[PDB]
Amino acid sequence: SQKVEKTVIKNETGTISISQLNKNVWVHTELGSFNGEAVPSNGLVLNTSKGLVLVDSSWDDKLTKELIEMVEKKFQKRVTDVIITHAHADRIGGIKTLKERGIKAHSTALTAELAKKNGYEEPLGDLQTVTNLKFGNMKVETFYPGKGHTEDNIVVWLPQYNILVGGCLVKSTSAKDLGNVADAYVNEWSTSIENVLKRYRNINAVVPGHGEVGDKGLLLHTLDLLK
Ligand SMILES: [Zn+2]
Ligand SMILES: [Zn+2]
């Protein structure tokens, strides 16, 4: 009888929020913790018929669980697939839970090479620079403009909605710099972004590594700080 009239999906705690980009895709944002502060990591939920999908897992298995025990009933679809942009706590951080239940972490051969270097699991890694994926009525093509946020940092592209997932590689409007370039290549970063605005210019919406979806303006944003 009693119900609210909202679109997004924010749990009682308010840590995990999923905004519906349209009617077949959402943006799951898992809030972590920077030791006293909050670290909201946006994402992308694909509403397919073959199974639910989320771009980049949660910070830690502790968070991922709360994200899988909420979307599995809210979306009416069980998660069994996840796209990995690179090797980071905001990507495969919760892979431990994705490779325990039955979630295939699609990634590039390299993504499954540097992942263990940090102590993470081993994803599919059966991807490449430019490839086409199919998750049942859900087409997802990747892209490797070069080195930037990581050694295999890539950007998920969706030709079904012209949506792009710049990820950490592409800073958000609410950013002042890249921050932490130890595991990244600022020498190729500016070179990778320029490729996402020269080749994959056509974008209806871009989702950075943190914050929310926007536009191509996020691409030039990275170079505006990593310059
Ligand atoms: Zn990252
Ligand atoms: Zn990040």
The structure tokens listed for 42 are: 């946006």
Phi, psi (deg, nearest 5) at residue 9: -135, 90
Q: ∠ at Cα 93 (217, 43), nearest 5°?
A: 30
Q: Determine the distance separating the centroid of ligand 1 and the alpha carbon of 14, expressed in angstroms.
A: 23
Instruction: Give the annotated binding-site residues for Zn(2+).
Output: 86, 88, 90, 149, 168, 210
CATH number, position 225: 3.60.15.10
What gap in Å lies between CA 109 and CA 123, rounded to an integer? 9
Whole-Å CA distances, 226 to 34, 175, 176, 179, 216: 22, 11, 10, 9, 16
166: domain range?
1-227
Phi, psi (deg, nearest 5) at residue 54: -140, 125
Q: Is 171 helix (H, G, I), strand (E, B) or coil?
A: coil
Residue 47 in contact with residue 9, Cβ under 8 Å? no
**What was the structure determination method?**
NMR
Ligand nearest the Cα atom of residue 39: 2
Give the number of C-alpha atoms closer than 13 A to the C-alpha of residue 206, restricted to the C-beta side. 26
Radius of gyration of the chain (CA): 16
Residue 91 in contact with residue 149, Cβ under 8 Å? no
Q: Determine the distance separating the centroid of ligand 1 and the alpha carbon of 86, expressed in angstroms.
A: 6
Residue 155 in contact with residue 146, Cβ under 8 Å? no
- What's the DSSP call for residue 79? E
Q: ∠ at Cα 29 (25, 33), nearest 5°?
A: 170
Alpha-carbon dihedral 142, 146, 149, 150, rounded to 10 degrees = 90
124 class by beta-carbon count within 10 Å (0-12 exposed, 13-18 middle, 19+ buried): middle
Q: Is 182 helix (H, G, I), strand (E, B) or coil?
A: coil
Q: How many CB atoms lie within 10 A of CB 2?
A: 3
User: Which of the following is catalytic: 42, 47, 81, 149?
Assistant: 149
Q: ∠ at Cα 90 (223, 74), nearest 5°?
A: 115
Write down the residue that tokens 């924010």 correspond to. 10
What gap in Å lies between CA 55 and CA 165, rounded to an integer? 8
- Strands of the sheet with 156-158, listed across from one edge: 132-134, 139-141, 156-158, 163-167, 205-208
User: Which of the following is catalytic: 28, 88, 106, 221?
Assistant: 88
Q: Is 214 helix (H, G, I), strand (E, B) or coil?
A: coil
Is 22 one of the catalytic residues?
no
Q: How many helices (H) and strands (E) does the chain have?
A: 5, 13
Q: Which amino acid is at 165?
A: V
Is 180 one of the catalytic residues?
yes
Is 187 one of the catalytic residues?
no
Is 90 one of the catalytic residues?
yes
Look at the chain and report how many structural domains it folds into.
1
Q: Determine the distance separating the centroid of ligand 2 and the alpha carbon of 213, expressed in angstroms.
A: 15
User: How far does Cα 106 stand from its chain's mean position?
Assistant: 12
Q: ∠ at Cα 202 (197, 207), nearest 5°?
A: 75
Among 63, 79, 77, 72, which Cα is nearest to 31's? 63
Is 86 one of the catalytic residues?
yes
Residue 183 in contact with residue 120, Cβ under 8 Å? no
Q: Determine the distance separating the centroid of ligand 1 and the alpha carbon of 90, expressed in angstroms.
A: 6
Q: Determine the distance separating the centroid of ligand 1 and the alpha carbon of 191, expressed in angstroms.
A: 17
